[PDB]
Amino acid sequence: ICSALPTIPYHKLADLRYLSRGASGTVSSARHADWRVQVAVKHLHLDSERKDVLREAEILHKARFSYILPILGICNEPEFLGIVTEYMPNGSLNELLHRKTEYPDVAWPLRFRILHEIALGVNYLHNMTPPLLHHDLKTQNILLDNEFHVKIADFGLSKWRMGGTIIYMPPENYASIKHDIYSYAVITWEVLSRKQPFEDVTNPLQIMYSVSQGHRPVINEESLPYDIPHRARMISLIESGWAQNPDERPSFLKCLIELEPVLRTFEEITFLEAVIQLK
């Protein structure tokens, strides 16, 4: 049973306003004239580049799931080419963690939920037939919806198993399955500390070396305070996740089995209260 990705004509994307620009592309916010919904469009900043945008779109369409950014349709024209997804009102996990003025408090339940969903998302990808590996996991590629639920995005590097920011990359990369878990491990450390992985390291190559020489972001009372709920288990999960030897890193399944009981501890309402605290 197949499902076709809808084709949207450029002239249906009203209020098309620049949102975010990165190397090679440009993301802009818009509203669908017919559907009456606020969307997001990812377009080119070409002959080969046209195939790339199609790859990502096909992947998002096949990989659709609860925690993967929903792709609403493709906008393919000779004039304009882009990907039409849902609009994520709360940006990326990166912004939430680090814009400490706007967000002075991000209560534990939400952080733990965020980590739980990311792990669910990735696990689903890995459980596809054939498996799909995101290969570009970072806090900027982890979007937050209107209620602060995770939506994994940016399948530009994702590879069907059959740069810029090397902070989330395992040393063996300087298709491997244990690449995503390494990244997840970093994201986890970054989520629980709100610090920047390797703040004191000015040069990406000083990082790349330090990492390949075993070193990882610091784990102590300053980075990961003793009040962090289930700290011991989280640290344990983190350390095993960013382990030097790929084989020593866990599967997302194992990771979820570890996470499940921890998440069962927070009362349903506390996640809602954690979000209202932001609004």
Binder of a copy of itself out of 41, 57, 114, 243 (CB under 8 A): 57
Q: From CA 194, how far away is CA 224, in angstroms rounded?
A: 9
- Which is closer to a copy of itself, CB of 135 or CB of 149? 149
Binding test (CB under 8 A) with a copy of itself, winner from 43, 62, 195, 231: 62
Q: Which does 85 bind (CB under 5 to 8 A by kind): Mg ion, a copy of itself, ligand ACP, none?
A: ligand ACP
Residues 57-96 that bind ligand ACP (CB under 6 A): 69, 85-88, 91-92
Q: Nearest to residue 243, comparing CAs of 175, 172, 192?
A: 172
Integer CA distances (angstroms), 20 to 30, 53, 77, in order: 12, 17, 22
Question: Phi and psi of 60, rounded to 5°?
Answer: -55, -35
Three-state DSSP class for residue 73: strand
**Residue 69: how many other CB atoms lie within 10 Å:** 25
SS3 for 247? helix
The one-character DSSP state at 66 is T
Phi, psi of 121 (to 5 degrees): -60, -55
**Residues in contact with ligand ACP, total (CB under 6 A)?**
22
Nearest residue to 137 (alpha-carbon basis) of 98, 198, 185: 185
Number of residues that bind a copy of itself (CB under 8 A): 42
Verify binding: residue 188, ligand ACP, rule CB under 6 A.
no
Q: Which of 14, 172, 260, 265 binds a copy of itself (CB under 8 A)?
A: 260
- What is the residue whose two structure tokens read 């000083």? 206
Contact call for residues 27 and 2 (beta carbons, < 8 A): no
Among 24, 146, 165, 173, binds a copy of itself (CB under 8 A): 146
CA separation for the pair 31, 273 (Å, rounded): 30
Report the residue from 15, 147, 172, 248 that binds a copy of itself according to the rule CB under 8 A: 147
The site string for ligand ACP over 192-231 (x = CB under 6 A, - otherwise) reads ----------------------------------------
Binding site for ligand ACP (CB under 6 A): 19-20, 22-25, 27, 40, 42, 69, 85-88, 91-92, 140-141, 143, 153-154, 156
Q: Which residues bind a copy of itself (CB under 8 A)?
A: 1-6, 34-37, 54, 57-58, 61-62, 64-66, 70, 72, 74, 86, 120, 123-124, 127-129, 146-147, 149, 253, 256-257, 260, 268-269, 272-273, 275-276, 279
Residues annotated within the binding site are 19-27, 42
